[PDB]
Ligand binder design. Structure first.
Ligand SMILES: Cc1cc(CCCOc2c(C)cc(-c3noc(C(F)(F)F)n3)cc2C)on1
Ligand SMILES: Cc1cc(CCCOc2c(C)cc(-c3noc(C(F)(F)F)n3)cc2C)on1
Ligand SMILES: N[C@@H](CCC(=O)N[C@@H](CS)C(=O)NCC(=O)O)C(=O)O
Ligand SMILES: N[C@@H](CCC(=O)N[C@@H](CS)C(=O)NCC(=O)O)C(=O)O
Lengths: 237, 264, 235, 235, 264, 237, 264
C-alpha cells in the first residue's frame, strides 16, 4: 500500500496527548442539557471571590473559629503592629488554604494584583483610625508606623465605614512569580498599625473583633498546571 | 493553520423597603447566581397554587448567646408542615419551587456581633460513627426545629443502639471544608452595627427539571456567629433570631394518595 | 501583548489522564481454592483522591470520557518453565446483564456487551465513552435518600437506605480475564486504568476538601487539624 | 552561484540532540536497605559540557525544547529466572508539587502532573516543551544574589545566599519508576535524556570557555595552562 | 515544493570635543551594540530625577606602574554612595538606568603603554576556594574602590575562617576565558602615543525591563594593561588613571522605607 | 482502515531529524519577548570580530599576558624575520584558540578571505618601516626579505600610522578547505621583516611591543558542523 | 499518473596542412571530447603569456626498433624546463593550460608497422614492489626523457634500498586494464602505409577550475607499437619518433618566490 516510515515516539502513551479514539457505544442518544444556574467557564473566576483569612494561627487558636478573628482594644500598645504577613498567596500558611491559594497550588506560575478587605465588628459607639500598609520587597520588613508609612498605605476610619479595601498592584521584575517560597520572586509585606486609638464611651465593650478577606482582580493569570500537596493517600479502598 | 479531520462518526471520539408576596408583607437583597425563580419552560397537567402556597411562613425563634455555635435547616424539609404547601408536597410525586429567605435579628447600638448566613446547594452533612452513610431519614429531616453545630467531633461509641445522627463541626462547616471558603456559596453578613436583617432569593437548582420533594432536599441554610455576641460588661447576653421563608413559582405533578412518612 | 487565561479553562484544567483503578489478574492452573483468574471492578472515580478532589470543586458536571489501559506482567517462581505472550479480555457489564462465575463461562461470548482484546507488548489500549447520565447532568453530591419509610410499613427495614446514594448499581462493572490457558509457571499481571474527562461543563462551584476522605461520602474520622502554627505579627 | 551561510545560523547551530542525563533505575524485591526502585533527577543542562559550552557563547537566550528518552535494560545474575517486558513511568514534578517517598505512593496518580508511560522495546519516547521562563529570556549568567544582608538582621545567616544563583528550585524534577512488580531476578535499566533546542534566539555574544568547568558557576580549579608551545619564527 | 501540514494545536509541537550632561561638562566615542539609552516603552508611577541623578560622578584615582595587573568595577554598585542616585536606589525596590563611562589617563610623548577597557554584561567572577559560589555579598560589592586582578590563582587554604573573596586571573579575565577574545565585548584601547582618554555609552541590558539595583549588578568595567608602562630608562614609573561615570535615563519604582545593607 | 506499508528506517531515532511531537503543557501562556540589545543571527558574525593573537607561545611566556606581545627594538638583526606562521585558522596553535578558530573548530569545511591587523605600542618619538608578506603554498617558506617580497606584501610606516591592516584573499584549487592539518589543502605562509630599522632619539625607550589581531570578511563560509576538541569531561556530577 | 510529494526540506532526502601557433609552424586532427581549450569563465589577477608560452616545444627524439615496447610521458611534467613556461610554473602556486600534441614518424613504402597514441586523463601507473603507493616523486616525474613499458612484471626484491619506480606492463597499459580498451581514451593510429604523423588537441580536464602544476599532472601520453616494425628481409630496423607539444590558453596565479624541486 502507501509507503510509510515510523518516527520516534510511536506506540508511546503521553497523558497530556490529544488524539481520536473509537467509541465503544455507537449510536447513543445523549440526554439534552438544561440551563442550570451557576455555570463556571474559568477557574480564575473562583479566585476572584473573597474568602476569610485565618490570620490568627496561634497554637491554642489554630484549627478553630477564633483563628478567623483579630482582637482590637482601646488599651493596646499603639506603637506595636496589629498584624503582619508576607505577600505569598500560595506558600504563606495564612493565605495558602484560601480559595485563591487552593487554586494557585494547582499551578506553578502566577501574576496579577490582589484585593484585601477588612471588616470591623465592633459597636456603633466605637471610633478609631487604622493604617494598612504594603511594602515592596528589598528592604527590612517594617516594624513601626514611621517605616510603614513610607510605602503604599491607606488610612481607614472605623466610625464612618465598617469595611475597608486595599488594592495591592502588580510590581515585579519578572513577568511571572512562582507559587513556592523563593527569595528571587518575593512579593513584599503587609502590615497594620494604629493611626489613632479606639475610643468607646461608658457602658460599652472595650474589646472587639476584626475579620479579613482576600481576592484576585481581573488582571490575574496562572501557568503550568501541577499537582497539589493538600491531599494525600496511603491505601487503596 | 494546522490541519485536522475527524474520522469517527461519534462526537465522543473527536479530540478535545417592603416586600409583599401573596397575603404577606415584610418591611440590599441578594439573588443567588443572578437567576430569579421561574416556572418550567416549554421544553400530565401540573398543579400550581398561585397564592395558597407562595407566601411567607415564619419558623420557630431561636436564641443567640455567648456559647451558640450555629444552626442549620434543610429545604423543602423545613416547610413540610406549613399550610397547603405540605399537603401539595405529600399529595404529589414530583415538585419544584424556589425560595425567598429572610433572617431577622435586632439589637441595640451597644451590642456587637456578626452572623453569617449561607445558602448551600446539595448540603450533605457528616455522620457521628465509624459506619459510613448510616444516618437515618428521621434524623436527617429535623423539620422546623432544625439542628445545631458543634465545636468538636463526638464519636458515638455505642454499637448496641447507634444513634445515627449528624455531627457537624463549626470550623469544618459539617462537610470537611474550611468555613472561610463558605463565602463561595451565596451568603449574607448581618453586622449589628450596620444592619439587622438579611434577605436571599434562591432559584430552583438540581440536575433535573423536577424531582421528588420528600426524599431529596434541594437547599440548606446555615447560620453561624462569625464574631461572638457581647453587650457592655455583662456576663450573659441572649437575643432572638427569626427566620421567614416564602415559596416562589411552585409546581406539582403526579397526584395520588397521600404520603405519610414515619418521623419517629 | 497581555497575559491570557488559556490554561485556566475547565477543559485545560481537566485535560490530563488520572489513574482510578489498579486490578490484579493471575494466570495459573485452576484449583479448588480461591484464585484471581478473572477480576471484576466496580466503576467509580472515588477509589483515588486527586481526580476526586479536582471534580468535587463543583456540584454538577457533564462530560464525556476517555479511558486508557496499561498492562504489566511478571513471573512469580523460577523453577517451572516459561510462558508465551498472553491476550487479555476486558468486558463491560452494564446493570442487569449476567455476570461471570468462572473465567471460561458463556458470558464471555460478548454477543452484545462491548469488549476489548489486548495483546501484551503492544501500545496501551484506549477507548472513548459519551455522556451516559440518566438525568441532565452528573450529581457529585446528593442530599437525600432512595426510599422513604412509611407509618404503614410492616418493619423499619422496608424503607431503610443509605444516605446520599442514588442507585445500588451505577455504570456497571468491568470484567478482566486472561484468554490464554495456563502455562506450567504462574504469571501475575496488573491493569492500570487512566481516565480523562473531555467536553466538560460544570455548575455550582464548591469549596475543596480540607481533610482526608473517609468513604464515598463526606464523613471525616481523623486528622482534623490541617493548619499549622504561625505568629500573628510574624512575617 | 556564491557560497551561502545556511548552516551557520543559530537554528542550524543548535539543531542536534545532546545528552544531558543518564539515570539508573532497578527492579527487584524491596528490602530494608537503600535501593534504586525510583529515581529523581533535577532538571538542568550543566551536567554535561558540550551543550553547556555551546549555549554559553551567549548571555541571554529564548527557545523551546524537544526531549527524547532512550531506555536500555539488562540482567545482573543468571540463577534466579527470567522477566517479562517492563513498563516505565516518567513524571514531571514542578516546584511546590508533592514528591514521592516510595515507588508506589499516591503521588504517582498524576492527576494533574503530566506523565509518560513507555513500553520497553518500542521507539524512544519524545515530547516537546514551550518556553517557560518567568522573565522575558533565559539568563545563562546572573551577577548577583537572591538575598541582601541588613544591618538590623539578628544574625548573618538570614541574608546569606549563593553567588550567581536565582532560585533554589528551578524547572522542577523528573521522577522515573518501573510500574511492573518485581520478578525473582533483578533487572537494571538506564534512561538517557537527549535535548534539542528549537526556535532559538540569543543575545550578547560571549567568549567560550577555555578551561575545564568546575561546578555550576564560573569557578576554575585545575588545568589553567591550555595553550601549547611553539616557535615565534617557526611556520 | 515539499508539502507540510502542522497537526498539533501548539506552536512548540511544530517542527523547526565637549560632552555636557546636567551640571557637568567634560572636554571617538563608542556606543555599545549601537543602542542609545532610552526610557521604558509604552508596553505605579515611576520616579525619574532628570538632572539630580543624571550627571558625571568621579571615582577615586588609581596608580598605574610597571607591576599593575588590572582593575575592575561593578555597576550600579560603584555609584551606591553618589548623591541622590544612591538614595533613590535604596528608597526603591526597582531601578533602571544606562551609563556613560569616561576613562582618563595622560602622559608624555616619551612614555609608552596601552590600556584595554572592556564593558561586560553579567560579569561573573570566580572564587578563591574549593567551595563553589561561596563568595560573600560584601566582598562581591567593593563599591567605589573596586578590585584588582592577579597573575596566578592563590587558593585560600583556611577552613577555620574562609575569606570568601574573588581571585581573578589576568589572562583568564577572571572567568575562565582567554583575554584575547575579550574584544568580543564592547571595548576601547587607550594607546599613549595616539590618545589619552576613552569613552563608552552603555544602554540598559537585562532579561527584564526593570530589576532591583541592590542584589544584581548589570555591568562590569575591566581595565587591563595590554602593554607594560615604560618611560625613558627609568626603573620606576607611575601615572594616574581616573574614571568618571554618568547615569542616563534612570527610572525608579516601588517606594518604601530605606534599605541599609551591612557592608562589613 | 487505510492500507499502509512500513518502509526501512521505521522506529529509529536520528538526532538530526526534524519531526513533530506532542506538547506536554498545552494552553501555556508564553511570556512575550522584548527588544534586548546584542541579538545575533549568524555565527559568522562572531568570526568577523577582531581578537588578539597569542603570537609568542614560548615555554616561559605561554599561558601568560606576555604571550600577546611581540618585542621590537632598534638593535635587532635586520636580516632575520620578526614573526612567522602558517595560514591555518583552525589548526595552527597561534590561531586555533581565537574566536575565529573556536567557531571553525565546530565545523569541518571553511572558505573565504582573512583580515590581519597589527598595532604598534611604542612612543610617539619612534619611527620605522615594516614589511608584512603573505606567500601562497607550493614553494619553500620564505626565510629572507628578498624571498618574501616576491609574494603579496604591504609596507607599513610606524610614524605616520600606529596600526596596519593586510587582507589575505581567497586563492585555492578546491572550493572548500578542511579545518584540520592537511598538505592537500594548505593555505600559505605569513611573515614579517624590517624594511628599515626602528630609530629613537635620546631619553626614549629602545624596546617596544606590538600586538596582532585577526578576523574574517563578509565572503566567509563554513560547512559540516561537528564537535570540538577544546572541551572534555571525565566524570558526571 | 502516480502521486508523489516530497516531505523533507533537503534535496538529498528526495527519492531518486600547416598549423601555426605563436612563432612556430608545423606542416586529420583529433579534438578530445569535442572541446577546444578555453580560458576560465566569468564565474587576484591571473598572468597570461599570450605568446611567450603558447608555442611548440620539441622533445628528445626516440628510436623505434623490433624490440621496443612503448613510451610514456606526463604533462605538464614534460615541459617543466621549456622556456618561460617552466618559469611561470615555478613562480606561481596555481596554473592551468591545454595542449596540442604532434607525433612525427616517417618511413618508406617498403616499411610496415602501426603506432597507437593515447591521451589519458589522470594516468596513474603501478609500482614495482609489494608496498603500495610507495613510488617517489623523482621517479614519477621523469620529465622530457619520459619512461618505457615492459613485457612482464619485474618485482624489486630489495628491502635494503628499494628503487621506488614504476613497472608498467604493455598489455595491461601499466594500470591493470587491457590495452584493447585503451581506445576509449582519445587516441590516434599512425599506420606507415597511410600516414606519418598524428595530432591531438587536449583541453584542460580536472575536478577544479585551477590547480597546482607541480604536484599534480593532468595528462598522460602513451605510445605503443600495435604492429611490429619490419623492413624488407633485414634483421635490424630503427627509425626515429619525435614529439612536439604546444601549450594553449595558459593561465597562472599566486606569484611568490620560486620553487626548486629536488630531482635527484
Ligand atoms: C461521574 C461519573 C462518570 C463515570 C463513568 C461513566 C462511564 O462508565 C463507563 C466506563 C468507565 C466504561 C465503559 C466501557 N464501554 O466499553 C468498555 C470496554 F469496551 F472497554 F469494555 N468499557 C462504559 C461506561 C458507561 O463515573 N462517574
Ligand atoms: C535554560 C534552560 C531551559 C531548561 C529546561 C526547561 C524545560 O524543563 C522541562 C523539562 C525538561 C521537562 C518538562 C516535562 N513536561 O512533561 C514532562 C514529562 F511528561 F515527560 F514528564 N517533562 C517540563 C519542563 C518545564 O533548563 N535550562
Ligand atoms: N505500596 C502499597 C500501595 C500501592 C498502591 O496501590 N498505591 C496507590 C496509592 S495508596 C497508588 O496509586 N500508587 C501508584 C500507582 O501504583 O499507580 C502496595 O504496593 O500495596
Ligand atoms: N566510564 C564511566 C563514565 C560513564 C559516563 O557517564 N560517561 C559520561 C561522560 S564522563 C558520558 O556522557 N558517557 C557517554 C554516554 O554514556 O552517553 C562510568 O561508566 O561510570
Amino acid at each position: 500500500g502507501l509507503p510509510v516510515l515510523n518516527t520516534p515516539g510511536s506506540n508511546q502513551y503521553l497523558t497530556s496527548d490529544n488524539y481520536q479514539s473509537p467509541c465503544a457505544i455507537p449510536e447513543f442518544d445523549v440526554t439534552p442539557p438544561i440551563d442550570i444556574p451557576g455555570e463556571v467557564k474559568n477557574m480564575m473566576e473562583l479566585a476572584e471571590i473573597d474568602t476569610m483569612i485565618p490570620l490568627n494561627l496561634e497554637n491554642t487558636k489554630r484549627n478553630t473559629m477564633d483563628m478567623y478573628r483579630v482582637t482590637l482594644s482601646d488599651s493596646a500598645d499603639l506603637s506595636q503592629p496589629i498584624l503582619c504577613f508576607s505577600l505569598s498567596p500560595a506558600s504563606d500558611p495564612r493565605l495558602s488554604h484560601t480559595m485563591l491559594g487552593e487554586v494557585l497550588n494547582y499551578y506553578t506560575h502566577w501574576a496579577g494584583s490582589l484585593k484585601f478587605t477588612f471588616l470591623f465588628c465592633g459597636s456603633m459607639m466605637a471610633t478609631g483610625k487604622i493604617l494598612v500598609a504594603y511594602a515592596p520587597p528589598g528592604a527590612q520588613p517594617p516594624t513601626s508606623r514611621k517605616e510603614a508609612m513610607l510605602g503604599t498605605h491607606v488610612i481607614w476610619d472605623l466610625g464612618l465605614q465598617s469595611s475597608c479595601t486595599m488594592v495591592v498592584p502588580w510590581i515585579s521584575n519578572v513577568t511571572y512569580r512562582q507559587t513556592t517560597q523563593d527569595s528571587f520572586t518575593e512579593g513584599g509585606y503587609i502590615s497594620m498599625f494604629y493611626q489613632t486609638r479606639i475610643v468607646v464611651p461608658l457602658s460599652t465593650p472595650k474589646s472587639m473583633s476584626m475579620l479579613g478577606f482576600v481576592s484576585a482582580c481581573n488582571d490575574f493569570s496562572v501557568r503550568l498546571l501541577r499537582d497539589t500537596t493538600h491531599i494525600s493517600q496511603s491505601a487503596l479502598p | 493553520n494546522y490541519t485536522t479531520i475527524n474520522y469517527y462518526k461519534d462526537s465522543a471520539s473527536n479530540a478535545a423597603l417592603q416586600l409583599t408576596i401573596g397575603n404577606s408583607t415584610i418591611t440590599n437583597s441578594v439573588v443567588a447566581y443572578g437567576r430569579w425563580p421561574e416556572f418550567i419552560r416549554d421544553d400530565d397537567q401540573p398543579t400550581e397554587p398561585d397564592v395558597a402556597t407562595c407566601r411567607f411562613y415564619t419558623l420557630d425563634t431561636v436564641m443567640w448567646g455567648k456559647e451558640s455555635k450555629g444552626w442549620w435547616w434543610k429545604l423543602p424539609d423545613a416547610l413540610r408542615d406549613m399550610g397547603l404547601f405540605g399537603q401539595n408536597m405529600y399529595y404529589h410525586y414530583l415538585g419544584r419551587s424556589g425560595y425567598t429567605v429572610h433572617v431577622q435579628c435586632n439589637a441595640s447600638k451597644f451590642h456587637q456581633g456578626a452572623l453569617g448566613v449561607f445558602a448551600i446547594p446539595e448540603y450533605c452533612l457528616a455522620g457521628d460513627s465509624d459506619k459510613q452513610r448510616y444516618t437515618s431519614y428521621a434524623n436527617a429531616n429535623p423539620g422546623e426545629k432544625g439542628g445545631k453545630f458543634y465545636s468538636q467531633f463526638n464519636r458515638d461509641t455505642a454499637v448496641t443502639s447507634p444513634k445515627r445522627e449528624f455531627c457537624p463541626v463549626d470550623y469544618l462547616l459539617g462537610c470537611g471544608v474550611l468555613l472561610g471558603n463558605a463565602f463561595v456559596y451565596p451568603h449574607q453578613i448581618i453586622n449589628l452595627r450596620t444592619n439587622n436583617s438579611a434577605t436571599i432569593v434562591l432559584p430552583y437548582v438540581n440536575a433535573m427539571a423536577i424531582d421528588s420533594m420528600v426524599k431529596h432536599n434541594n437547599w440548606g441554610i446555615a447560620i453561624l456567629p462569625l464574631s461572638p455576641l457581647d453587650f457592655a460588661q455583662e456576663s450573659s447576653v441572649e437575643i432572638p433570631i427569626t427566620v421567614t421563608i416564602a415559596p416562589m413559582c411552585s409546581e406539582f405533578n403526579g397526584l395520588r394518595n397521600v404520603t405519610a412518612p414515619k418521623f419517629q | 501583548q497581555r497575559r491570557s487565561r488559556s490554561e485556566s479553562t475547565i477543559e485545560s484544567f481537566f485535560a490530563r489522564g488520572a489513574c482510578v483503578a489498579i486490578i490484579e489478574v493471575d494466570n495459573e492452573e485452576p484449583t479448588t481454592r480461591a484464585q484471581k483468574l478473572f477480576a471484576m471492578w466496580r466503576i467509580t472515580y472515588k477509589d483515588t483522591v486527586q481526580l476526586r478532589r479536582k471534580l468535587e470543586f463543583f456540584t454538577y458536571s457533564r462530560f464525556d470520557m476517555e479511558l486508557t489501559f496499561v498492562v504489566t506482567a511478571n513471573f512469580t517462581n523460577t523453577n517451572n518453565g516459561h510462558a508465551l505472550n498472553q491476550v487479555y479480555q476486558i468486558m463491560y457489564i452494564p446493570p442487569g446483564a449476567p455476570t461471570p462465575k468462572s473465567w471460561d463461562d458463556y458470558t464471555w461470548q460478548t454477543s452484545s456487551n462491548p469488549s476489548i482484546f489486548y495483546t501484551y507488548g503492544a501500545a496501551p489500549a484506549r477507548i472513548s465513552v459519551p455522556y451516559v447520565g440518566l438525568a441532565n447532568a452528573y450529581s457529585h453530591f446528593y442530599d437525600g435518600f432512595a426510599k422513604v419509610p412509611l407509618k404503614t410499613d410492616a418493619n423499619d427495614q422496608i424503607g431503610d437506605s443509605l444516605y446520599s446514594a442514588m442507585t445500588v448499581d451505577d455504570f456497571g462493572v468491568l470484567a478482566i480475564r486472561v484468554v490464554n490457558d495456563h502455562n506450567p509457571t504462574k504469571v501475575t499481571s496488573k491493569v492500570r486504568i487512566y481516565m480523562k474527562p473531555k467536553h466538560v461543563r460544570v455548575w455550582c462551584p464548591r469549596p475543596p476538601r480540607a481533610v482526608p476522605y473517609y468513604g464515598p461520602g463526606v464523613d471525616y474520622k481523623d486528622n482534623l487539624n490541617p493548619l499549622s502554627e504561625k505568629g500573628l505579627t510574624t512575617y
